[PDB]
Amino acid sequence: AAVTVEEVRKAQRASGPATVLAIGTATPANCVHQADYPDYYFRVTKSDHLTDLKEKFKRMCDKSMIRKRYMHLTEEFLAENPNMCAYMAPSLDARQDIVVVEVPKLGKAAAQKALKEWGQPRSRITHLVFCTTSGVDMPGADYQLTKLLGLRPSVNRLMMYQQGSFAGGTVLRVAKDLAENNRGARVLVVCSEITAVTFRGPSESHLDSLVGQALFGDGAAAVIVGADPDERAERPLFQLVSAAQTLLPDSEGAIDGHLREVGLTFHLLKDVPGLISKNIERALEAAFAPLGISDWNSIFWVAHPGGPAILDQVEAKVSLDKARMRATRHVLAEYGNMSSACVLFILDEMRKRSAEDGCATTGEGLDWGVLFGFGPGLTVETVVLHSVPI
Amino acid sequence: VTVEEVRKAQRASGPATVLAIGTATPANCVHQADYPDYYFRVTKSDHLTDLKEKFKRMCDKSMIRKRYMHLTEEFLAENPNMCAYMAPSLDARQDIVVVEVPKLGKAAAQKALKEWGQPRSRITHLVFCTTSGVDMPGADYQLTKLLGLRPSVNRLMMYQQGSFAGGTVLRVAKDLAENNRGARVLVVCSEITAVTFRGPSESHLDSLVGQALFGDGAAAVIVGADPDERAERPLFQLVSAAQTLLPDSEGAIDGHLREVGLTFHLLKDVPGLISKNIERALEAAFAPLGISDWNSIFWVAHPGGPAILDQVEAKVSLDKARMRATRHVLAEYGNMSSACVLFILDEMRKRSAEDGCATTGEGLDWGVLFGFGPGLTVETVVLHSVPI
């Protein structure tokens, strides 16, 4: 009645670009070393008699380029739940009972670290973006995390369920609009993935699911995003310049994922590394041409480590310097494939190594960077990042 | 090129505007007057006469005249596990909704896109919201294919949201259309009850009441900033958007996706809790605008149930005409979860047209859209009508 909508819009809106104010990561305590996983996995699933199948899983884990992973699932638990140890056995209820609890709990550990580095009180958080691919529930994990952290009972929550490995970029793309369109907004972004929904025994008939057993790991990464940082009170890490999403052509059913009574099952049709390599440059050009940037070796890289073959085939297609994917490959080695949370681990790794290596910026000395998310549909999320002087 | 130069050229200017609304439902229509007989027949529960009497009272007090349901008596005959109260059936239910949910959303999206009149290539964002099943790639991907939208459309997949997500999608579309020059957000809420349909159980009347209220439907809305005065005709403006959790409302509405499907659980007094807090939500949204006469703003309230509307309307002594659109959608469609408030929007502007009302908001200037759902979550969207 007093103010007009244009006056509200003018007042409501923020200035400046969405900025990463803090990054925090967390994993389950239980740590499984990749060198020992073929024996561990084949023992807990009672499959040591399938010798030829175990030999293939050994080479699978050898090619994985993963040194270790963290998993909430323990041998003691798995001994009590043979329905989650067989390849195809009704067990979704058992799996949901775990993830609907542990996924929010692990996200709290990651967000607690991000908030402590942030230094501001939780009460300043105005937006919560929670993303997971491990189970669904109502109220969602976003509700669980809010209660666990004690966030304001008016936080604008966004719950990303069953998204897939590309959601790491989707959450940044979402946070970018939330922080930039609302003046004092402070967005807590949380990705949390626990493999208890996809863990299952081996089968010589469904080898695509076997690679998942060699790559998927548990973990959560939290990020605090906001525009117009408070100087001397907040420490800008990266800037979210732009975000785009796209579907690669001829990639229709490349990676399918179905939530059934046997839990979450993944199905691999078509060459995923090849499909990404053939089109990565086109994604790079769409995001950096209006920027006047052509040298793909002049920008710091953040790529979802879906598998070592994806990294190799993209690094070879565009002739990347082997230092550009150093942070990406490092996270894959110490954590495995953690689905959406992976790209947020690499961000934390890149900035951590940069400050420890005396780089000029948080982006390995470079100014501009690119963040790639890869997942079902052959969806590619592309986020143009910018570093901050160190 | 510096980041600041990007930000200035990349963000939109005016307020987020609803440019079109389209709705769609399954063909099969089921009349509330016959549902007690039908429901207890297909579920083979006619031996529970005392229960059938309770259900009949549920349906008669529901203020629902008819509902649309993809589930047919023929299909239910071939799937007795979905007619039982608790029997393994998630695979069967998923097989339906992963296919029909995007398809029903396509029917509504076609309508909306037609009224919009612009080429489908101009759609830059897609927000897909459903509580009926999950899949990878999600329903957003299937709809992108079905509609022929551009690859590179920015998709947001809202799975397993609940009955408050009608407001959620608007909140999302608002920030998307306002921060990005040229963005045109296609918003689709699509719900199908084949994931919650189940037989009756004397020990769980709360699940039984869901069987009397929930219905199928999809609604599409096209949201954009800075409309084209020539090619585009605005319908509503999204001024603000806010979500909040209601105190002492823990466990009021729970929903679990299990091997027997999606089961709903009811604790506490949902209408009493929403009525007890509705005035705080109004004041929080409208006090900074100088508004305090709830009778002089149009209303779009999620019709989670008749009691909710009655008790909210009684709390603020609402002019009974303020809920006519909400209650009509409830009567003619039932509780379609997230899509409800969008159906109500469409019925508001349409009734506003054939009535000779000065605005799309029943002649009024400012309005409120409420979404109610699990966590006792309340979404509050402040709207502004458009002159007719």
DSSP string, A195-213: GGGT-----TT-HHHHHHH
Contacts of B18 in chain A (CB under 8 A): none
d(CA A157, CA B359): 32
Residue contact A161–B162, C-beta within 8 A: no
Which residues face A268 on adjacent strands? A255
- The beta-carbon neighbor of A163 closest among B131, B157, B253 is B157
Q: Please, what's the b/e burial string for A340-349 (b: 16 or more CB within 10 A of its CB; e: otherwise)? A: bbbbbbbbbb
Which residues face A25 on adjacent strands? A221
Contacts of A174 in chain B (CB under 8 A): 156
Q: First and final CA of chain A: distance in angstroms? A: 48
Instruction: Please report which residue ranges of B237-339 form alpha helices under DSSP H.
Output: 270-286, 306-315, 324-333
Q: Please, what's the b/e burial string for B166-194 (b: 16 or more CB within 10 A of its CB; e: otherwise)? A: bbbbbbbbbbbbbbbeebbbbbbbbbbbb
Q: Which residue of A has its CA nearest to B255?
A: A138
Residue contact A13–B243, C-beta within 8 A: no
User: What kind of architecture, by CATH, is found in domain A238-387?
Assistant: 3-Layer(aba) Sandwich (3.40)
Most A CBs within 10 Å, among B2, B3, B98, B294, to test the A interface: B3
Contacts of B91 in chain A (CB under 8 A): 260-261
Contacts of B247 in chain A (CB under 8 A): 153
The type of residue at A258 is H
State the nearest Cα–Cα gap between B8 and chain A, in angstroms.
Answer: 9
**The two structure tokens encoding residue B382:** 């402040």
d(CA B299, CA B295): 9
Query: Phi then psi for B257, rounded to 5 degrees?
Result: -95, 105
Do residues A145 and A104 make contact, with C-beta atoms less than 8 angstroms apart?
yes
User: What CA–CA distances, in Å, run from B10 to A326, A359, B4, B69, B151?
Assistant: 32, 30, 10, 43, 20
Do residues B19 and B232 make contact, with C-beta atoms less than 8 angstroms apart?
yes
Question: Is the CA virtual torsion A303, A307, A310, A311 positive or negative?
Answer: positive
Contacts of B130 in chain A (CB under 8 A): none
Residue contact B162–A182, C-beta within 8 A: no
Residue contact A245–B155, C-beta within 8 A: yes
Number of inter-chain CB pairs under 8 A, A vs B:
185
User: What CA–CA distances, in Å, run from B189 to A17, A78, A128, B126?
Assistant: 30, 39, 22, 11
Q: Which residue has the tokens 């239980």?
A: A30
User: What is the spatial order of strands in the sheet that A127-132 belongs to?
Assistant: A156-161, A127-132, A186-193, A219-226, A19-26, A238-247, A379-387, A368-375, A300-303
User: What CA–CA distances, in Å, run from B69 to B23, B24, B25, B211?
Assistant: 15, 12, 8, 11
Q: Which residue has the tokens 């070879």?
A: A316
- The beta-carbon neighbor of B257 closest among A136, A248, A286 is A136
d(CA B65, CA B225): 38
Question: Is the CA virtual torsion A273, A275, A278, A284 positive or negative?
Answer: negative
- The beta-carbon neighbor of A5 closest among B176, B284, B384 is B384
State the nearest Cα–Cα gap between B159 and chain A, in angstroms.
Answer: 6
**The two structure tokens encoding residue A348:** 């934390």
d(CA A57, CA A70): 19
Q: What 3-state class would DSSP assign to B77?
A: helix
Which is it for strands A219-226 and A186-193: parallel, antiparallel or unpaired? Answer: antiparallel
Q: What is the DSSP string of A281-347?
A: HHHHHHHHGGGT---TTSSEEEE--S-HHHHHHHHHHTT--TTTTHHHHHHHHHH-B-GGGHHHHHH
Q: Which residue has the tokens 């959450």?
A: A171
**The two structure tokens encoding residue B105:** 């959303």
The type of residue at A243 is A
The type of residue at A1 is A
Domain spanning B236-384, CATH class: alpha beta
- The beta-carbon neighbor of A153 closest among B161, B237, B244 is B244
Contacts of B104 (CB under 8 A, 6+ apart): B24, B25, B26, B70, B190, B192, B216, B217, B218
Which is it for strands A127-132 and A68-70: parallel, antiparallel or unpaired? Answer: unpaired
Q: Which residue of A has its CA nearest to B176?
A: A177
- B381: buried, middle or exposed (CB in 10 Å: 19+, 13-18, 0-12)? buried
Q: What is the DSSP string of B123-141?
A: --EEEEEESS---BS-HHH
**The two structure tokens encoding residue B21:** 């609304």
**The two structure tokens encoding residue B161:** 């949201």
Do residues A241 and A385 make contact, with C-beta atoms less than 8 angstroms apart?
yes
A357-360 long-range CB contacts below 8 Å, 24 or more apart? Answer: A359/A390, A360/A389, A360/A390
Residue contact A259–B135, C-beta within 8 A: yes
Query: What does the DSSP 8-state code read for residue B150?
Result: P
Q: Which residue has the tokens 């349409």?
A: B350
d(CA B175, CA B187): 13
d(CA B147, CA B57): 42
- The beta-carbon neighbor of A162 closest among B138, B152, B377 is B138
Experimental method: X-ray
Do residues A69 and A218 make contact, with C-beta atoms less than 8 angstroms apart?
yes
Name the nearest CA neighbour of A155 among A176, A116, A117, A185.
Answer: A185
- The secondary element (H helix, E strand) that includes residue A387 is strand A379-387
d(CA B164, CA B331): 19
Query: What does the DSSP 8-state code read for residue A366?
Result: B
Instruction: Please report which residue ranges of chain B form alpha helices under DSSP H.
Output: 3-10, 35-42, 49-60, 73-77, 80-83, 90-116, 139-147, 165-179, 205-213, 270-286, 306-315, 324-333, 340-354
Q: What is the DSSP string of A141-185?
A: HHHHHHHHHT--TT-EEEEEES--TTHHHHHHHHHHHHHHHSTT-
- Indicate the resolution in Å: 2.1
Angle in degrees, CA A105, A153, B134, rounded to 5: 55
- B351: buried, middle or exposed (CB in 10 Å: 19+, 13-18, 0-12)? middle
Most B CBs within 10 Å, among A3, A4, A5, to test the B interface: A5
**The two structure tokens encoding residue A232:** 């001397």
Q: Which residue has the tokens 């179905």?
A: A258
Contacts of B228 (CB under 8 A, 6+ apart): none
CA dihedral B332, B338, B342, B344 (to 10 degrees): 40
d(CA A2, CA B288): 9
A212-215 long-range CB contacts below 8 Å, 24 or more apart? Answer: A212/A266, A213/A41, A213/A57, A214/A34, A214/A37, A214/A57, A214/A60, A214/A61, A214/A64, A214/A66, A215/A64, A215/A66, A215/A306, A215/A307, A215/A336, A215/A337
Do residues B191 and B70 make contact, with C-beta atoms less than 8 angstroms apart?
no
State the nearest Cα–Cα gap between B291 and chain A, in angstroms.
Answer: 6
Cα radius of gyration rounded to whole Å, chain A: 21
d(CA B120, CA B223): 14
Query: Phi then psi for B283, rounded to 5 degrees?
Result: -60, -45
